[PDB]
Protein: Salicylate biosynthesis protein pchB
Amino acid sequence: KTPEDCTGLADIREAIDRIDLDIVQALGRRMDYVKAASRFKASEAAIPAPERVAAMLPERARWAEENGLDAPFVEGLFAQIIHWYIAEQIKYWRQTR
Amino acid sequence: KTPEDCTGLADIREAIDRIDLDIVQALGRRMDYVKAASRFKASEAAIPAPERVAAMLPERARWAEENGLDAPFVEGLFAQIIHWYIAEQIKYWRQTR
Ligand SMILES: O=C(O)c1ccccc1O
Ligand SMILES: O=C(O)c1ccccc1O
Structure:
């Protein structure tokens, strides 16, 4: 149901649970691409790609802005996420070669 | 392209940007449902529903477990997301109710 067709918290919570599961499934598939990424790193030191992160974060802020969400909170959340995936990628690189 | 069909970082980053966009879009729609939730609350006090949050978090850990992601990271990320939405819902309630 749309937010305005929701008759109570049962409806609201079904939709929220679905959206959050979608997010979890996307973060899981995100990990697949991050591991695949390590095939195109020339060295371990290539992994963090700070210029790439610098480009990503304002992009995510813009998306926040365009979707009616506080840009600082979303951008900072994605800073945490991206740096966490980087850390995982390093660990994965080390463990698989 | 699938992670395994990606032929370089150009392909990897296209898919990651698509995934991160879907996540921002989903957080955007989630906000609509959180604000709609408020017309089913009594005062600033019924808003945080601690019994609801407590059931939510290990459900999110489980989904992370089933999607091959570190469960504390995902559980911790959602504690952060959920508590920020509660905050926004209180602000929203003050502003409109
Ligand atoms: O996960 C990412 O988005 C990322 C970005 C830059 C470098 C390494 C990474 O894992
Ligand atoms: O955003 C939520 O998931 C939430 C959960 C419990 C209480 C208030 C809320 O906004």
Observations:
- Chain A touches chain B through 48 residues (CB under 8 Å).
- Residues A 34, 37, 47-49, 52-53, 82, 85-86, 89; B 16 surround 2-hydroxybenzoic acid (ligand 1) (CB under 6 Å).
- The two ends of chain A are 48 Å apart (CA to CA).
